[PDB]
Amino acid sequence: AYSNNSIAIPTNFTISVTTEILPVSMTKTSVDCTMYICGDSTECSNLLLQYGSFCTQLKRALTGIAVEQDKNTQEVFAQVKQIYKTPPIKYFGGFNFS
Amino acid sequence: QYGSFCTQLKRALTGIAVEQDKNTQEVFAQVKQIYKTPPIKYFGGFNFS
Amino acid sequence: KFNGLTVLPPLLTDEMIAQYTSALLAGTITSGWTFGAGPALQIPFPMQMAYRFNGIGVTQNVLYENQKLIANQFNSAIGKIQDSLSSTPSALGKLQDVVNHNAQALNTLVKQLSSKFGAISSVLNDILSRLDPPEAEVQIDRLITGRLQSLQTYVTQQLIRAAEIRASANLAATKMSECVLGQSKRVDFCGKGYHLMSFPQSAPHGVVFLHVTYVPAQEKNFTTAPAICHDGKAHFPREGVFVSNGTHWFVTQRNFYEPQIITTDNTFVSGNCDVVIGIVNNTVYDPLQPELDS
Amino acid sequence: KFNGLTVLPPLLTDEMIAQYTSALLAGTITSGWTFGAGPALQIPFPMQMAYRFNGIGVTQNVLYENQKLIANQFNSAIGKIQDSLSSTPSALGKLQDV
Amino acid sequence: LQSLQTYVTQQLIRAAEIRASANLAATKMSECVLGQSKRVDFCGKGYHL
Amino acid sequence: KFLPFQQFGRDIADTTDAVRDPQTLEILDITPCSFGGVSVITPGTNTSNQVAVLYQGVNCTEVPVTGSNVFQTRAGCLIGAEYVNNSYECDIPIGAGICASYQTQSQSIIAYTMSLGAENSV
Numbered sequence: 001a002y003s004n005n006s007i008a009i010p011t012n013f014t015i016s017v018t019t020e021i022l023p024v025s026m027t028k029t030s031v032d033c034t035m036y037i038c039g040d041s042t043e044c045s046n047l048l049l050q051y052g053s054f055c056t057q058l059k060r061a062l063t064g065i066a067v068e069q070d071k072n073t074q075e076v077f078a079q080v081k082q083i084y085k086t087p088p089i090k091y092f093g094g095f096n097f098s
Numbered sequence: 099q100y101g102s103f104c105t106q107l108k109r110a111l112t113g114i115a116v117e118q119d120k121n122t123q124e125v126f127a128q129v130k131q132i133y134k135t136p137p138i139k140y141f142g143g144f145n146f147s
Numbered sequence: 148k149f150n151g152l153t154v155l156p157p158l159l160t161d162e163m164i165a166q167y168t169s170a171l172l173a174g175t176i177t178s179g180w181t182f183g184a185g186p187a188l189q190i191p192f193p194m195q196m197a198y199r200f201n202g203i204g205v206t207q208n209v210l211y212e213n214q215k216l217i218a219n220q221f222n223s224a225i226g227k228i229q230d231s232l233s234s235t236p237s238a239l240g241k242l243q244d245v246v247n248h249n250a251q252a253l254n255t256l257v258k259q260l261s262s263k264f265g266a267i268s269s270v271l272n273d274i275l276s277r278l279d280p281p282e283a284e285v286q287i288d289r290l291i292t293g294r295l296q297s298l299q300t301y302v303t304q305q306l307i308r309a310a311e312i313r314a315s316a317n318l319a320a321t322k323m324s325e326c327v328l329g330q331s332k333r334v335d336f337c338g339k340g341y342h343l344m345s346f347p348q349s350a351p352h353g354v355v356f357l358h359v360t361y362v363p364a365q366e367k368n369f370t371t372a373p374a375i376c377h378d379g380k381a382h383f384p385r386e387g388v389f390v391s392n393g394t395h396w397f398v399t400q401r402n403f404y405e406p407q408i409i410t411t412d413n414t415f416v417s418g419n420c421d422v423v424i425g426i427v428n429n430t431v432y433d434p435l436q437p438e439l440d441s
Numbered sequence: 442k443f444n445g446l447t448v449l450p451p452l453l454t455d456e457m458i459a460q461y462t463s464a465l466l467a468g469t470i471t472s473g474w475t476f477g478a479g480p481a482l483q484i485p486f487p488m489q490m491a492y493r494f495n496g497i498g499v500t501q502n503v504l505y506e507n508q509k510l511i512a513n514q515f516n517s518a519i520g521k522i523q524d525s526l527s528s529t530p531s532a533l534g535k536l537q538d539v
Numbered sequence: 540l541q542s543l544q545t546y547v548t549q550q551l552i553r554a555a556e557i558r559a560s561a562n563l564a565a566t567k568m569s570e571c572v573l574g575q576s577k578r579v580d581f582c583g584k585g586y587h588l
Numbered sequence: 589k590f591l592p593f594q595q596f597g598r599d600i601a602d603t604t605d606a607v608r609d610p611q612t613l614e615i616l617d618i619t620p621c622s623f624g625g626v627s628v629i630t631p632g633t634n635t636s637n638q639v640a641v642l643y644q645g646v647n648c649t650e651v652p653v654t655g656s657n658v659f660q661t662r663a664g665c666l667i668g669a670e671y672v673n674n675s676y677e678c679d680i681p682i683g684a685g686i687c688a689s690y691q692t693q694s695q696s697i698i699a700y701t702m703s704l705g706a707e708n709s710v
């Protein structure tokens with residue numbers, strides 16, 4: 001109802017509590033390149049040795065992911081220096097929190 | 099005989115396609131009602147035409 | 148335990164994550180936003196809520212006068228959160244999506260072991276036994292390059308998925324700092340409404356923020372004016388807006404209707420009544436004259 | 442569609458996107474920031490500009506005693522936007538690159 | 540198959556970039572259109588109105 | 589309980605899980621032979637040449653054999669570090685809340701459950 005001198009002002013209010021859900025980490029996995037590709041076939045191992053250093057850099061990539069997951073969690077949750085405890089008497093002015 | 103290469107390719111492209119619509123939804127569908135501007139377009143001298 | 152693939156346990160156990168979340172809740176409830184910027188200074192919880200009401204532009208007497216109602220509304224809203232999460236089967240669907248993509252990648256990787264990769268058979272022992280060294284060597288090399296490419300694809304997809312998880316965890320850490328450890332003035336950061344508080348809760352591989360916000364409820368139409376003319380001077384409200392119920396003029400605060408008499412205490416003077424477009428004629432009370440004359 | 446490559450239309454049409462942006466503009470012009478936090482509460486537009494001026498640290502009388510000048514400056518700047526978009530190569534360069 | 544796999548990987552990287560841009564656009568819609576911002580240079584050069 | 593005609597079980601990923609013994613008809617589970625990575629935990633070589641070894645995701649009734657200290661963590665078996673009952677800030681993260689560090693004990697590698705901080709009641 002826009003007019004050139006009219007205003008609307010709220011006379012009450014409500015308290016909303018809404019929920020937001022955020023992913024933080026994922027599963028840390030590792031792979032044995034040899035045991036995946038070959039599986040105790042010594043011929044396969046010998047052949048695989050002649051493809052270079054693919055195995056080591058897959059290993060390095062997955063290790064980087066795994067370390068990053070723990071860093072993710074630490075930088076979301078370890079934001080308090082001290083472990084605070086709530087008082088034994090749980091009266092907070094009528095607010096419940098239980 | 100090459101395995102499930104082409105089920106996961108299709109799944110990846112479908113994920114991208116769903117994500118594009120989600121992108122547009124979160125940018126533009128923020129307002130809950132369709133607000134209309136009044137027929138009289140006087141706003142104190144500011145011109146929004 | 149399958150084919151050289153392993154799952155590493157996270158460094159922080161779920162009990163430790165819950166200890167963190169409990170420390171954050173205790174800090175918020177007992178000290179407000181002070182524990183995030185220095186030492187935790189205690190304050191009664193209603194006084195903290197009055198500070199939060201000040202922070203969204205509502206005067207603290209409103210909190211103190213509607214304390215019981217505000218407490219009841221909060222308690223009902225928290226109960227409804229519990230109920231809503233007990234229902235609506237897919238409310239935690241983002242966490243499930245992360246888990247499911249992780250599982251699908253691994254099962255695809257395992258099932259790629261059985262693919263012939265253009266070779267005679269997928270078993271290394273069979274290719275070893277049933278052919279001479281050179282031909283079996285070529286067949287095994289075909290298998291090897293197939294499996295290596297599949298593994299490289301898996302690692303690249305994991306890198307991309309981890310970049311996305313890092314973006315999400317960066318957002319979650321920003322929200323812990325700005326919604327839980329403070330009161331945010333950014334709009335729709337920290338939920339819809341005027342942010343008052345947030346509470347963290349730990350979830351499997353994730354976090355849940357309960358955002359407590361203030362929502363204006365029951366509107367009334369009023370007539371308004373930019374300034375009021377008295378003694379040839381223009382008066383503007385120091386904080387608030389001039390409103391009229393049809394006959395009388397009051398000054399109120401912009402977010403809650405609480406009308407007051409227009410006084411030299413709640414207005415300031417600037418210029419004359421000639422330049423402002425829409426200035427109305429009314430009287431501005433001066434407390435000093437009646438309490439000086441009497 | 443050429444060789445097994447196809448392009449899927451977006452769920453929201455450009456007319457629907459235009460409707461959303463028009464609703465956002467109507468809300469901002471008629472109610473201010475109130476419709477982003479609850480119900481939309483009408484306010485005269487100069488008073489909303491006065492609130493914005495208080496927001497940046499200037500008083501209300503600076504708006505109300507220069508209202509015509511401020512409105513003229515805004516109108517001129519908007520017209521300049523129109524022109525500056527008509528004639529500048531690769532002004533919309535990001536969308537083109539996408 | 541390799542060429543198609545590379546196409547899908549490039550599409551995933553490009554989609555991640557577009558998603559960052561669209562998240563920024565959603566933040567700017569919330570904080571510059573649905574409110575008034577105090578963050579410096581988040582909306583424009585000067586004091587945001 | 590295989591059906592009378594069924595010979596070998598198989599899992600979700602189509603890996604053989606059980607078999608029927610052909611001579612005598614009983615069902616035998618097949619479990620993969622234990623494997624895992626081996627991590628070496630060191631303080632810098634600038635402090636000591638002492639070492640602890642972690643066999644990740646392995647119960648160490650199967651480890652063939654640093655130090656004779658042998659500890660079972662949820663991450664695997666730890667050899668060469670002793671588990672103490674104190675708690676400190678995490679120095680070297682082992683996993684599942686277990687960390688390791690070089691400490692006076694004179695010096696040796698210890699394992700412990702990390703502390704999250706110091707308690708504080710406001």
Ligand SMILES: *[C@@H]1O[C@H](CO)[C@@H](O)[C@H](O)[C@H]1NC(C)=O
Nearest residue numbers: 002003004005138140142424
């Ligand atoms: C508000 O007042 C202005 C005069 O400044 C006038 O042009 C405009 O039409 C008025 N609007 C209405 C709805 O009366």
Ligand SMILES: *[C@@H]1O[C@H](CO)[C@@H](O)[C@H](O)[C@H]1NC(C)=O
Nearest residue numbers: 011012013014216220364365
């Ligand atoms: C505000 O709303 C509550 C319901 O949440 C109601 O009980 C109360 O009477 C209302 N206050 C006024 C002043 O109408």
Ligand SMILES: *[C@@H]1O[C@H](CO)[C@@H](O)[C@H](O)[C@H]1NC(C)=O
Nearest residue numbers: 090091095096097098222226
């Ligand atoms: C808090 O809410 C619970 C319901 O979950 C209720 O049983 C309890 O009595 C409430 N606390 C107080 C102090 O009433």
Ligand SMILES: *[C@@H]1O[C@H](CO)[C@@H](O)[C@H](O)[C@H]1NC(C)=O
Nearest residue numbers: 139140144145146147516520
């Ligand atoms: C708004 O500006 C346009 C030019 O862009 C002009 O033609 C129009 O008359 C203006 N509107 C008013 C109400 O003056």
Ligand SMILES: *[C@@H]1O[C@H](CO)[C@@H](O)[C@H](O)[C@H]1NC(C)=O
Nearest residue numbers: 001008009365366367368369
């Ligand atoms: C204000 O008046 C308009 C009619 O001009 C009406 O549509 C609107 O509902 C009224 N607002 C309230 C809060 O009653």
Ligand SMILES: *[C@@H]1O[C@H](CO)[C@@H](O)[C@H](O)[C@H]1NC(C)=O
Nearest residue numbers: 391392393394395396397406
């Ligand atoms: C406006 O409020 C005053 C309170 O001072 C009251 O006396 C008067 O009756 C009200 N007028 C209308 C039209 O409601």
Ligand SMILES: *[C@@H]1O[C@H](CO)[C@@H](O)[C@H](O)[C@H]1NC(C)=O
Nearest residue numbers: 376378379420426427428429
């Ligand atoms: C306000 O009062 C002054 C002097 O009493 C008069 O000149 C002016 O016209 C009045 N304004 C209105 C709108 O009645």
Ligand SMILES: *[C@@H]1O[C@H](CO)[C@@H](O)[C@H](O)[C@H]1NC(C)=O
Nearest residue numbers: 592608609610611612613614
């Ligand atoms: C095979 O012969 C042995 C002889 O001792 C007997 O115990 C077993 O049941 C026989 N199995 C079958 C399948 O006939």
Ligand SMILES: *[C@@H]1O[C@H](CO)[C@@H](O)[C@H](O)[C@H]1NC(C)=O
Nearest residue numbers: 646647648649660661662664
């Ligand atoms: C091996 O260690 C695990 C603990 O991770 C235990 O549950 C299991 O029973 C152990 N196995 C034997 C044979 O003791």
